[model samples]
Target: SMEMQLTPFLILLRKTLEQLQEKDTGNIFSEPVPLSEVPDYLDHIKKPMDFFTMKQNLEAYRYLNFDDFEEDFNLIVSNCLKYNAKDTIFYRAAVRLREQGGAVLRQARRQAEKM
Candidate 1:
């Protein structure tokens, strides 16, 4: 068996981005917006994934590793919290990332044991 599994977090991230686009937000920002303006931008989010902070958080995890994935993961979670992302798809996505991260780590450990 290949024993390779697709990442649930990435799946969730894509789904979340799709849902955000489904909402009809016109265009996502091409660059990071000011932190103070995040709330205003979110209020009328044209594209959640395009949101600067969201992009930044996601970018931090582009390269994953056992050693520092958790730290990068926490940065995203913390960003969500700081921005009061409650009830937003972004926040829900972050929550799923945490859950999926745990699942992936456990699976990795199991695979190691089998070797």
Candidate 2:
């Protein structure tokens, strides 16, 4: 239920901010590349010097999605050990988030090595 509530709200907020950003910039880039494409794109680069740029880009987007839900996200992270006290789904999703973060980091490191 929390995920159902939070994800859509966060997505809506992100889209609103994106619209404002584009209006301010006169729509230079009309569409955002989905976050899922990041690792795939990273795999194509083949020089070490490219790593810094890749790092900056990844870091930028990593936090970008958290702007609205940061407080809730932090609460979940800090009290994750107790998450089951509230709901099983929260605990499950928390574990999944951790696993996903690990995979993302692993891909980023492999990408860096290629760069």
Candidate 3:
């Protein structure tokens, strides 16, 4: 019998990504910052990342492991924090994501390892 399915870690990674995307504070992270809107985004945040890209990568199995997936998620938060000023909405939301989303990602990895 052959079963074609996502790996256990990838399944959890997607679940954690959805959890982050559902956060009200996560709206800005939903898609890549449009060049039309933030014209200098590429100049500042060189390696841009967003939930949409994360999902695409997962579907394509772009990450070799959960840790690699975690790196991209970290980049998503850090890039926003770096590019936006501290008092801005995006910056505040990024802090929440770093705390909430990071926790969930780590938890998923632990669960996946045990599974």
Error of 3 at 24 (Å): 4.7
Q: Give the clashing residue pairs of candidate 1, or none.
A: 25-46
Runs of candidate 2 exceeding 4 Å displacement: 1-78, 83-87
- Model 1 RMSD in angstroms: 9.4
Please identify which of the two predictions, 2 or 3, would achieve the higher lDDT against the true structure.
3
Candidate 1: stretches off by over 4 Å: 1-65, 109-115
Top lDDT: which candidate number? Answer: 3
Q: Ten residues in a row with the worst lDDT in model 3?
A: 1-10
* Backbone clash count for every predicted candidate, in the order shown: 1, 2, 0
**lDDT of each residue in 1-115, candidate 2, tens digit only:** 2234434444443443333333323221223323374555335422212122323333455433333223323333334434244456545544554454335434433433343
Residue-by-residue lDDT tens digits, candidate 3, 1-115: 1333357657777788898787635488888888798888888887999899999998898985677788889898999999999989889998988888877877877876675
- Rank list by lDDT: 3, 1, 2
Model 2 TM-score on a 0 to 1 scale? 0.28
lDDT (tens digit, per residue) of candidate 1 on 6-28: 36554444444334333323332
Clashing pairs in 2: 47-115, 48-115
